[PDB]
Design an enzyme around this catalytic site. Structure first.
Site, PDB file in Angstrom:
ATOM      1  N   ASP A 157      30.118  20.064 -16.588  1.00  0.00           N
ATOM      2  CA  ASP A 157      31.138  19.024 -16.631  1.00  0.00           C
ATOM      3  C   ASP A 157      32.226  19.447 -15.649  1.00  0.00           C
ATOM      4  O   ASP A 157      33.001  20.351 -15.948  1.00  0.00           O
ATOM      5  CB  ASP A 157      31.721  18.934 -18.042  1.00  0.00           C
ATOM      6  CG  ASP A 157      32.570  17.705 -18.249  1.00  0.00           C
ATOM      7  OD1 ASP A 157      32.683  16.888 -17.306  1.00  0.00           O
ATOM      8  OD2 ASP A 157      33.125  17.559 -19.357  1.00  0.00           O
ATOM      9  N   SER A 160      32.255   8.701   1.729  1.00  0.00           N
ATOM     10  CA  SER A 160      31.919   7.286   1.787  1.00  0.00           C
ATOM     11  C   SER A 160      32.725   6.685   2.920  1.00  0.00           C
ATOM     12  O   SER A 160      33.650   7.318   3.411  1.00  0.00           O
ATOM     13  CB  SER A 160      32.286   6.600   0.472  1.00  0.00           C
ATOM     14  OG  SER A 160      32.604   5.241   0.689  1.00  0.00           O
ATOM     15  N   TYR A 203      39.126   3.947  -6.087  1.00  0.00           N
ATOM     16  CA  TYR A 203      37.921   4.583  -5.588  1.00  0.00           C
ATOM     17  C   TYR A 203      38.228   5.137  -4.196  1.00  0.00           C
ATOM     18  O   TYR A 203      37.921   6.286  -3.888  1.00  0.00           O
ATOM     19  CB  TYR A 203      36.768   3.564  -5.505  1.00  0.00           C
ATOM     20  CG  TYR A 203      35.517   4.146  -4.879  1.00  0.00           C
ATOM     21  CD1 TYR A 203      34.836   5.198  -5.491  1.00  0.00           C
ATOM     22  CD2 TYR A 203      35.050   3.689  -3.642  1.00  0.00           C
ATOM     23  CE1 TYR A 203      33.728   5.790  -4.883  1.00  0.00           C
ATOM     24  CE2 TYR A 203      33.943   4.274  -3.024  1.00  0.00           C
ATOM     25  CZ  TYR A 203      33.290   5.328  -3.654  1.00  0.00           C
ATOM     26  OH  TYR A 203      32.223   5.942  -3.037  1.00  0.00           O
ATOM     27  N   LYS A 232      38.391   9.017  -2.597  1.00  0.00           N
ATOM     28  CA  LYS A 232      37.573   9.371  -1.433  1.00  0.00           C
ATOM     29  C   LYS A 232      38.436   9.706  -0.213  1.00  0.00           C
ATOM     30  O   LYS A 232      38.045  10.514   0.636  1.00  0.00           O
ATOM     31  CB  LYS A 232      36.611   8.223  -1.076  1.00  0.00           C
ATOM     32  CG  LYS A 232      35.360   8.140  -1.959  1.00  0.00           C
ATOM     33  CD  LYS A 232      34.841   9.539  -2.324  1.00  0.00           C
ATOM     34  CE  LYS A 232      33.338   9.569  -2.623  1.00  0.00           C
ATOM     35  NZ  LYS A 232      32.997  10.500  -3.750  1.00  0.00           N
TER      36      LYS A 232
HETATM   37  C1  LIG Z   1      33.765  -2.117   1.426  1.00  0.00           C
HETATM   38  C2  LIG Z   1      32.256  -2.358   1.773  1.00  0.00           C
HETATM   39  C3  LIG Z   1      32.067  -2.447   3.368  1.00  0.00           C
HETATM   40  C4  LIG Z   1      32.622  -3.730   4.080  1.00  0.00           C
HETATM   41  C5  LIG Z   1      32.089  -5.011   3.378  1.00  0.00           C
HETATM   42  O1  LIG Z   1      32.603  -6.169   4.014  1.00  0.00           O
HETATM   43  C6  LIG Z   1      32.446  -5.043   1.856  1.00  0.00           C
HETATM   44  C7  LIG Z   1      31.915  -3.774   1.128  1.00  0.00           C
HETATM   45  C8  LIG Z   1      31.202  -3.901  -0.027  1.00  0.00           C
HETATM   46  C9  LIG Z   1      30.637  -2.709  -0.833  1.00  0.00           C
HETATM   47  C10 LIG Z   1      31.156  -1.289  -0.398  1.00  0.00           C
HETATM   48  C11 LIG Z   1      31.323  -1.171   1.179  1.00  0.00           C
HETATM   49  C12 LIG Z   1      31.587   0.280   1.730  1.00  0.00           C
HETATM   50  C13 LIG Z   1      30.680   1.385   1.087  1.00  0.00           C
HETATM   51  C14 LIG Z   1      30.715   1.340  -0.504  1.00  0.00           C
HETATM   52  C15 LIG Z   1      32.104   1.861  -1.046  1.00  0.00           C
HETATM   53  C16 LIG Z   1      29.865   2.245  -1.466  1.00  0.00           C
HETATM   54  O2  LIG Z   1      30.330   3.560  -1.064  1.00  0.00           O
HETATM   55  C17 LIG Z   1      29.075   1.329  -2.473  1.00  0.00           C
HETATM   56  C18 LIG Z   1      29.243  -0.185  -2.149  1.00  0.00           C
HETATM   57  C19 LIG Z   1      30.237  -0.108  -0.937  1.00  0.00           C
END
Ligand SMILES: C[C@]12CC[C@H](O)CC1=CC[C@@H]1[C@@H]2CC[C@]2(C)C(=O)CC[C@@H]12
Ligand SMILES: C[C@]12CC[C@H](O)CC1=CC[C@@H]1[C@@H]2CC[C@]2(C)C(=O)CC[C@@H]12
Lengths: 284, 284
Positions: B65, B142, B155, B159
């Site tokens: 954990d 990310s 989130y 990150k």
């Molecule tokens: C913001 C963005 C990327 C830009 C898109 O227009 C909207 C979007 C939807 C889901 C997000 C992604 C970036 C990467 C993310 C944060 C993950 O890490 C899981 C789903 C994800």
């Protein structure tokens, strides 16, 4: 009555100077609610308020612990005007030293105050600003939230966090009429700043002799930058005022263009190796 | 015996795929310690380990954990080899929704797990890597830690925080021989990902009707991006391997160059207005 401003962490630094600068403004169009964690430290604020002859009723002090949401709520209600036009999220905390030597509670405290704290503020005052269709939020940042600095791992983590939190909201607030801005400060003439930096034995027993020797080198180099680049709080507090009055504010305001060169090369090479080497030399 | 790797958050996603990919490597030069918060979820990992016929003794599961330092310490000792060559900080948590609708404990949890959690890991295993003068640390990032995304405020905060924390350490580790790298992932084919997104009434009662309507618009647009850009975990898990084998690793690895265009214009205008407008259109 007139633009109602609420500022957090007013016991000193940017917060205290900004509060009196607002309250003592010649136009008298600002009503200031200076917030502090412990009231027994409101002295300096009042003393400074007399120095600038702030009219009576333009400055009020409230006890507010951003680490607690019940205190955040109790405060919002102490706001007689029943409205907040400008929220300045300034409460901040620093942490210096090699990662392994930092306590766990200290790391949690810095993030709880610096990051969760401004989230709690945003939660209690953002809804209302959306209803109205107008509002201004000022968040004090640092260049340490734009680029990593050795021995400032957690501090930079919390400030980098504010950049992500704010950059995210801004995308969604654009059509709501409430504006959000970050004020990116470089070092700011705080005598106490160059006194906090200086931890020999206590650090030395929780880290190796080579990390400690590098810490010394960082402290040495930082105090040189502080003495040759630190600006006056009045210069910085005035940037907040510029942001506060722009008809269409931008997302970021830089109190100085000095560190812009370094930020550029960090944006030129996304892999980050150029920055990591460049920064390692200007500190070692 | 051979390269000892320890990975956090292996109950699924990148973590699970990375662990079996390592353990089942033809060279058999990796000994994997897959960590999980709750052991009752180790099923999928073992089932996947049989699918790829992982030799016996190349994969061990430990309960850990990251929200607790006593569990972090107990684990480090369960490491028979008495050494960790590759630390992969993967444990992560997501949070979607408008700020005001997010619980306080949920926000604190995401930061405690995502940020303080990897700090705790770094604290218990970094010293030893410094003594040795060799070590590798992989942190899964990310694109949400490189640019703000609406409705992903906390989130992105967590990150963005990892970027600052790691960028800071890297400056200091350069001469110690231990390397640190971030693996910047875009969306990753997780069926469960596009199922989490879909919160009607519960959200609607803690926010206004215009924020909710925008949330719907975000969900709609995101599921479109997911379906047209999500990559296979094997493609992503292989980037970790590339980072793991580079003689001189860089600080950042991008699993895709797709989102690089958007990152550029965000580095072209430091005030942030170009990004804020650009991103607002590609989501609304
Ligand atoms: C913001 C963005 C990327 C830009 C898109 O227009 C909207 C979007 C939807 C889901 C997000 C992604 C970036 C990467 C993310 C944060 C993950 O890490 C899981 C789903 C994800
Ligand atoms: C990293 C840097 C800026 C780059 C210098 O080489 C070293 C240095 C020392 C003190 C830091 C400063 C950035 C701004 C900081 C973080 C403050 O916000 C107070 C003192 C400050």
């Amino acid at each position: 009555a007139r633009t109602v401003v609420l500022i957090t962490g007013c016991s000193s630094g940017i917060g205290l100077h900004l509060a009196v600068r607002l309250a003592s403004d010649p136009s008298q169009s600002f009503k200031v609610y200076a917030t502090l964690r412990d009231l027994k430290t409101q002295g300096r604020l009042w003393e400074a308020a007399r120095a600038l002859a702030c009219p009576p009723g333009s400055l009020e002090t409230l006890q507010l612990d951003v680490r607690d949401s019940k205190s955040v709520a109790a405060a919002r209600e102490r706001v007689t005007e029943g409205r907040v036009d400008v929220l300045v999220c300034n409460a901040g905390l620093g942490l210096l030293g090699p990662l392994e030597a930092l306590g766990e509670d200290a790391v949690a405290s810095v993030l709880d105050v610096n990051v969760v704290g401004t989230v709690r503020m945003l939660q209690a005052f953002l809804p209302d600003m959306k209803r109205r269709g107008s509002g201004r939020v000022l968040v004090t940042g640092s260049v340490g939230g734009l680029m990593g600095l050795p021995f400032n791992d957690v501090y930079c983590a919390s400030k980098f966090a504010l950049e992500g939190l704010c950059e995210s909201l801004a995308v969604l607030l654009l059509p709501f009429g409430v504006h959000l801005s970050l004020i990116e400060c470089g070092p700011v003439h705080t005598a106490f700043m160059e006194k906090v930096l200086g931890s020999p034995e206590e650090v030395l027993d929780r880290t190796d002799i080579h990390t400690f020797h590098r810490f010394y080198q960082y402290l040495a180099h930082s105090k040189q930058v502080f003495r040759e680049a630190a600006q006056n709080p009045e210069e910085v507090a005035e940037v907040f005022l510029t942001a506060l009055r722009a008809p269409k504010p931008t997302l970021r305001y830089f109190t100085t263009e000095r560190f812009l060169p370094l930020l550029r090369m960090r944006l030129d090479d996304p892999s980050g190796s150029n920055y990591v080497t460049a920064m390692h030399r200007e500190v070692f």
